[PDB]
Write a protein that binds this ligand. Structure first.
Ligand SMILES: O=C(O)CCCC[C@@H]1SC[C@@H]2NC(=O)N[C@@H]21
Ligand SMILES: O=C(O)CCCC[C@@H]1SC[C@@H]2NC(=O)N[C@@H]21
Ligand SMILES: O=C(O)CCCC[C@@H]1SC[C@@H]2NC(=O)N[C@@H]21
Ligand SMILES: O=C(O)CCCC[C@@H]1SC[C@@H]2NC(=O)N[C@@H]21
Lengths: 122, 120, 120, 122
């Protein structure tokens, strides 16, 4: 739907983010991580602002992967929160939170944080 | 299955109405008690539909883009956390709220916090 | 002045022993109840020594590098948050715990969480 | 003291981080931000691992600025948590938390998060 966001993207780790930005504000696609307790593709879903500001600001968005697929389950989920900055060197700039299922006793060490920059492969 | 589906509230008084699909999907609406928000917003997310059997929580996350028919804050929040069910269920999360900005102001684009939800 | 100086504990049972200098400095020791840590570690930090007068909290933060004479976890935590004093004082924080890693593993170097401290 | 960490660094915003890594594990210096509610230099203090692993891992560290100096007070503090990766293109890679003093009612919006990469000017 939104042609700028829709496509196949890679981040600095070489993970592959395949997404469609639909007329309804949804992000729908698959994610394949180059790192971590992950193999092959995982379902993702998210949302984006389908009417962004016309003042040069980016388009806010986010999405989630739960790290379960037909062949592995890491008992974990990542959410990416960020913005799409369009134009000739378009980027999706994010920060993310990866929470693993833990006992309450280990909950203090349940969540990793980082940042991913995605560039379109297209 | 999971016990996630239902109406939840957090420490701010916001309302999270969610349905957990058998496939790992989360769907529903979010209404914030605070910020540049009015009425309900669509959410989508994912959860681990086959959690560990060892007393660990269930990983999950979801997104809201803060545009609805009433208002658009040009921002989006993601919650990442764990669910524990049963009669005193709780969802314990950390969240990232990114506002659209120019690249020069990206350093001040993202708030971080933590929300605890209980079932209403 | 501020009321920060003292012995504090968090929800994990860790102990934060701090002195607030008149110049904005924080000094003292931290003992974690969890993780790759034993005994006391040095901390340093800073706080706003001239906070607003409007009922806002006092911004502060501090660092611990997890090396002492007993153990070295090759990691460091920073807490960033706000202090409210008085008889039921609390320090509400978010924290980032970075472990040294190679560049290939920097994506998994940093834990994030939130600690609430009360005075012992 | 530690010559690799000690020096004058700039980040991607053009802020200037002047630091000494002392034999006692302390970081001591000043910070000048290119952005935000800030002017001139602010005191910083922090800590670093003075005996890092010899396996190629970085050197963990962190520091704090409270945004009060002789001429402005933002009623806020930032902490940077990260690691120094030495060698010919040395970097200090961080994530940070900027908490502002707020009322309890506004505490939900008290804290910004981001990431800074510092390169040595020397
Ligand atoms: O190890 C796990 O729990 C599952 C895989 C996590 C991969 C993380 S998600 C954030 C970061 N960005 C990526 O592309 N991969 C890693
Ligand atoms: O102000 C905005 O940009 C939109 C509303 C944001 C509300 C935030 S989302 C994180 C926190 N938890 C809530 O229930 N509300 C606030
Ligand atoms: O395991 C390590 O690398 C060193 C100990 C880390 C303990 C962390 S710091 C954040 C949280 N709050 C605490 O009081 N302890 C844990
Ligand atoms: O606006 C304020 O409250 C004080 C100045 C904050 C500047 C922030 S700290 C994180 C980021 N990195 C910088 O070099 N400057 C900004």
């Amino acid at each position: 739907a939104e042609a700028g966001i829709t496509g196949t993207w890679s981040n600095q780790l070489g993970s592959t983010f395949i997404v469609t930005a639909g007329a309804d504000g949804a992000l729908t696609g698959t994610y394949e991580s180059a790192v971590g307790n992950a193999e092959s593709r995982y379902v993702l879903t998210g949302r984006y602002d389908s009417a962004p500001a016309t003042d040069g600001s980016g388009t806010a968005l986010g999405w989630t992967v739960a790290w379960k697929n037909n062949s592995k389950n890491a008992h974990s989920a990542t959410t990416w929160s960020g913005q799409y900055v369009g134009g000739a060197d378009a980027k999706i700039n994010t920060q993310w939170l990866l929470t693993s299922g833990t006992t309450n006793a280990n909950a203090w060490k349940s969540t990793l944080v980082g940042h991913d920059t995605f560039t379109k492969v297209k």
